Amino acid sequence: MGFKVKLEKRRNAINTCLCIGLDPDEKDIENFMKNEKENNYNNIKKNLKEKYINNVSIKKDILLKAPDNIIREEKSEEFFYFFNHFCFYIINETNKYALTFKMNFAFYIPYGSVGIDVLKNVFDYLYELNIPTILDMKINDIGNTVKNYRKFIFEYLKSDSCTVNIYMGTNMLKDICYDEEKNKYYSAFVLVKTTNPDSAIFQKQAYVIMAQEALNMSSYLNLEQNNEFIGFVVGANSYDEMNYIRTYFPNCYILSPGIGNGDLHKTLTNGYHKSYEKILINIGRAITKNPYPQKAAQMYYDQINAILKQNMES
Amino acid sequence: MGFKVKLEKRRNAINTCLCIGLDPDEKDIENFMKNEKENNYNNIKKNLKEKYINNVSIKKDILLKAPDNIIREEKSEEFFYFFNHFCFYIINETNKYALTFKMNFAFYIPYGSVGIDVLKNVFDYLYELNIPTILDMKINDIGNTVKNYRKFIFEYLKSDSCTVNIYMGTNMLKDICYDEEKNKYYSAFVLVKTTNPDSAIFQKQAYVIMAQEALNMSSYLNLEQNNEFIGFVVGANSYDEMNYIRTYFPNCYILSPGIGNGDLHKTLTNGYHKSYEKILINIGRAITKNPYPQKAAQMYYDQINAILKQNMES
Incomplete structure (x- = not known):
């Protein structure tokens, strides 16, 4: 298979370049838990109704149980249970509008082993859905050491891609x-x-030199002839460089975070490619913190679709 | 308290700047497990004899059990058990010669939640021993996001310090x-x-500019007047820059990895400071992969002590 083909297939299916950021914080998990009580668990119920919860491989028995007997019959798993279910809830609500989901590792490690159990299930759940994944971990170390990250990211999590900081x-x-x-x-x-x-x-300039070296590496590694790539993480408000990069490296893959305050049209237009999987537009909290996540996602999906329309010709 | 005072106190106790890298790989954990059978568990026994194993806060009951009934009465914990015990074994053997221990996060994440359980116990065990700690995670992200790392590193793990990649x-x-x-x-x-x-x-040059900005930040944050600092991670074989940094930033803290092939005298001499906690010399695998870890550590402790002697005056 391979991320390049995976991205092209799904782009041809759902015609967007929306990347939805799944960065759940402590207030998201608590706020979910609170109004899932005031909901009589309306959303967790729906989560419970999908093939796929049956395919996550960590503490499934606990996840499958009803919330009412989780609260009182397993208090040491309440956080786990509600963390994991919040993420499915976002995935279930929004996935139809997402070319990819990006998970920032930072939000899953601060509680210890527990959030990493969640992360693995998130990536398991997304894998079954065959939704293209990015782990935003910004890994960086010497060659021998980074192999531990390759194993965690690509073997354990079975991610399609990751972010890397190559300063050193x-x-x-x-x-x-x-x-x-x-x-x-x-x-x-x-x-x-x-x-x-x-x-x-x-x-x-320095970033152009580093960008060339990354693509030389991609070439050296034969990545593209194996349907893989090394692309760039380019800040949404970096209009000049976004444009320079899309111009000077015509067919490169860009991931662009930070719209959420941002001008969507301006970012997407400066990085536009007719194969618009090459310009991923990441939206996190504007979706995941919206009391109506599916609707927030539709809105960005729709906004993006209008911009692509204009770029294709106007 | 505070890392600056903590480092000064221990430097005045044991008079070295040896930093011991605890980077256990899959072959270390398997090789430990193998000759702990051929040993009739000689080293795990000694681990079992120290106050402090009683103070680690994750799956202690499992850690405290005898190895012979762990093998057959808990097979899903064998890896956990032997990972955790390998790290104590290294800590128990070597800690008397170490100014600090540095743990690379890469080696603890590739198995999922399990290695993070180990990591936490490692940092718990080192905390009780009051041994100064560095988590080598090379964290990097935007301000709002990196707060998850601050929580994981400084609140959950209770580390004294970490490594940071500030390229962005x-x-x-x-x-x-x-x-x-x-x-x-x-x-x-x-x-x-x-x-x-x-x-x-x-x-x-570019690295001098970035180094100034880091120290400006330290100053802005009032770190030093609170007994904390922002220092530099300088490669052992970077003799020119090591020297330039120690010269141009006289009282900065340096951590220097990579001796292990390296010239110890040359690295330590170029970064030398009479307060030699300011020039940490990291040695990992040359100690942890040596069939005699305590002896390997003594040897480096002794080598370092001779170099400091010469630098103090000759």
Whole structure:
């Protein structure tokens, strides 16, 4: 298979480049738990009705139980239960509008092992749905060490891709995007330090040099001829560089976070490609913190669809 | 208390700047398990004899059980049991020679939640021993997001410090080294991209500019007047820059990995400070992969002690 084909197939199915950020914080998990009591568990019920909850591989028995007997018959699992169910709830509500889901590792590690159990189920649940995944972990270390991340991200989680910080060098990508032993190829987006509108105006630039080296690495690793890629993480408000990157590297993959305050049209237009899986537009909290998540997602899906229409021709 | 005082106290106790890297890989945990059978569990026995195993807060009951009934009466915990015990074994054998222990997060995440349970116990065990800790996680993200790392590292793990990659900007440090709500101050080492002996010879430099901004941040955050600091992660073979950094930033804290092939004297001498907690020399696998870990540690402790002697005056 391979992330390039996976992205093209789903783009041809649902015609968007919306990437939905799944970054649940402590207040999301508590606020979910609170109005799932005031709801008589309206949303957890629906979660309970989908094939796929039966296919997550960590503490499934606990997840499958009814909420009312979870509260009082398993208090040490209440947080686990409600964390995991909040994420399914967002996935169930929004997935029809999402080209990809991006999970930031930061939101899943601060409670210890427990959030990592959740993460794994999230990636299991998304895998069954065959929804393209990005783990936003921004991994960075020397080659020998980063292989632990390749294993966690691509073997344990079975992610399609991850974000990587290559400040200290590109060679780390060898051991992230490629496994010699298994003959496996994985995709990544590298962080690019770009200017914002403030810093743009204040007095081969360095990021162009680092971007070339990343794509040279992709080429060296034969990634594309194996349907994988190394792309770029380009800030939504970095209009100049977004445009320069799309111009100078015509067919590169971009992931663009930070719209949520942002001008959607301006970001998507500067990074536009007719194969618009190449310009992923990440929206997190504007969807996941909206009291109506499916509707918030539709709205962005629709906004994006109008911009693509205009870009295709106007 | 505070990492600066903590480091000074222990330096005055054991007179070294040896930092021991605890990076256990799959082959370490398997090789430990194998010759703990051929040992009739000689090392796990000793682990079992220390106050402190009684103070780790995750699955203690399992850790306390005898190995022989762990093998057959708890097979789903064998890996957990042997991972955790390998780390205590290294800590018990080597801690007398270590100014600090550094744990690379990469080695604890690739198995899922399980290695994170281990990590927490490692940091619990080191905390009781009052041994100064560094979590080498190289965290990097926007301010709001990195607060999840501050919580995991400084609240959950109760680490003294961490490593940070500030390529995308210094402002992230605000939310890593400082907590407004709690009035808390934490220490970090930032990655510096330096040349090696190959790249040194091939055609304010950028790393000097980034280093200044990090120390400006330390100052802005009042870290030092709260006994905390932001220091630098400087590669052992980066002799030129090591020296430039120690010269241009006289009283900065350096952490220097990568000796293990390296010239110990050359690294320590270029970064030397009479307060030699300011030049931590990390040795990982040369100790942890040595069939005699305590002896390997003594040897490096002794080598370091000779170099400090020479530097103090010659």
